[PDB]
From Swiss-Prot:
Gene Ontology process terms (BP): negative regulation of nuclear-transcribed mRNA poly(A) tail shortening; polyuridylation-dependent decapping of nuclear-transcribed mRNA; RNA 3'-end processing
Organism: Schizosaccharomyces pombe (strain 972 / ATCC 24843)
Primary role: Cytoplasmic uridylyltransferase that mediates the terminal uridylation of mRNAs with short poly(A) tails such as such as act1, hcn1 and urg1 mRNAs, hence facilitating global mRNA decay. Uridylates the 3' ends of actin mRNAs upon S-phase arrest. Also has a weak poly(A) polymerase (PAP) activity. Residue His-276 is responsible for the specificity for UTP. Involved in cell cycle arrest where in association with crb2/rhp9 and chk1 it inhibits unscheduled mitosis.
Keyword vocabulary terms for this entry: ATP-binding, Cytoplasm, Magnesium, Manganese, Metal-binding, Nucleotide-binding, Nucleotidyltransferase, Transferase
Gene symbol of the encoding locus: cid1
Compartmental location: Cytoplasm
Residues of the full protein shown: 41 to 379 of 405
Cellular component per GO, a single term: cytoplasm
Residue ranges constituting the PAP-associated domain according to the UniProt record: 220-276
Protein name (database record): Terminal uridylyltransferase cid1
Molecular function via GO: ATP binding; magnesium ion binding; poly(A) RNA polymerase activity; RNA binding; RNA uridylyltransferase activity; UTP binding
Length: 319
């Protein structure tokens, strides 16, 4: 996989966030933090998601969280509308959300999403951020899987398919517990790991990355991707197994977890919030499309017709 790896890195460099775009988002965050400072002096606005882990595709949306220690939620929204930003305040039960649309100069096409005390989400981002720092192969691979999923119309949680985070965990599971030699260790199950309970969940992992030995896996990005597709296309049985980060071998049956009868069509156990299935959005019809597109990828990469048209891997599939 020399030619495929060459193609992979070419695509990766086209789809990744530019340093220009990154600095624009970081500048926007500093402006919004100043807004929060004048209304709540002890609250902090922390960034999470793709932009924070570095697993962000160009023209990505911003995900922020206001952390504190009540009315501050709505009070922050009104100060933002006052400071020229355009958006709406939405609250379901006791969970408020700010959805920003524009700016009158980071705008006009400037999207941003602010949450309140979503601590677990910040921790999942810390875990992915650490893995990104461990191996250089993870960032391109994740972006390429994300770009493929998006283009093949299998990245719609609202339409019976999997979330982008779903695919990130699908990649991590493969690189930690499936590939041999593994590309990564399991930082959650490390003997150096210490328990840290946040919102009734253990968010602890070995973050002292400097002391972690280098990977014994020397495979290319192209080879890694060919394996990932082949695994989920032909070896992984979602009617039997759970994608997990809580077993040393990675072996967890749906029987053992009790996820046999939210939807359990595709079982992806969240690393910290273990009660939550990241693949709950995946429907029976949707899984069929996911399985179909995985087999298609495998078929393409084992083609005997040269030169192989690798471009078809990122060809937009009908809606």
């Amino acid at each position: 996989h020399k030619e495929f790896t060459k193609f992979c890195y070419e695509v990766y460099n086209e789809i990744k966030i530019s340093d220009k775009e990154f600095k624009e988002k970081r500048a926007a965050l500093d402006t919004l933090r100043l807004c929060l400072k004048r209304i709540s002096p002890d609250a902090e606005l922390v960034a999470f998601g793709s932009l924070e882990s570095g697993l962000a595709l160009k023209n990505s949306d911003m995900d922020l969280c206001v952390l504190m220690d009540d009315t501050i939620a709505l009070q922050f929204y009104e100060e933002l509308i006052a400071e020229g930003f355009e958006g709406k305040f939405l609250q379901r039960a006791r969970i408020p959300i700010i959805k920003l649309t524009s700016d009158t100069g980071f705008g006009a096409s400037f999207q941003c999403d602010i949450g309140f005390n979503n601590r677990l989400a910040i921790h999942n981002t810390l875990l992915l951020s650490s893995y990104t720092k461990l191996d250089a192969r993870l960032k391109p691979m994740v972006l390429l899987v994300k770009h493929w999923a998006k283009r093949k119309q299998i990245n719609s949680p609202y339409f019976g398919t999997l979330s982008s985070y779903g695919y990130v965990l699908m990649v991590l599971y493969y690189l930690i517990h499936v590939i041999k030699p593994p590309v990564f260790p399991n930082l959650l199950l490390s003997p150096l790991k210490q328990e840290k309970i946040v919102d009734g969940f253990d968010v602890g992992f070995d973050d002292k990355l400097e002391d972690i030995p280098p990977s014994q896996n020397y495979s290319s990005l192209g080879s890694l991707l060919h394996g990932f597709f082949r695994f989920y296309a032909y070896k992984f049985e979602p009617r039997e197994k759970v994608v997990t980060f809580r077993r040393p071998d990675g072996y967890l049956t749906k029987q053992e977890k009790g996820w046999t009868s939210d939807r359990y069509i595709l079982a992806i156990e969240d690393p910290f919030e273990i009660s939550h299935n990241v693949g709950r959005t995946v429907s029976s019809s949707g899984l069929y499309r996911i399985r179909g597109e995985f087999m298609a990828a495998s078929r393409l990469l084992n083609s005997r017709s040269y030169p192989i048209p690798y471009d078809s891997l990122f060809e937009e599939a009908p809606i």
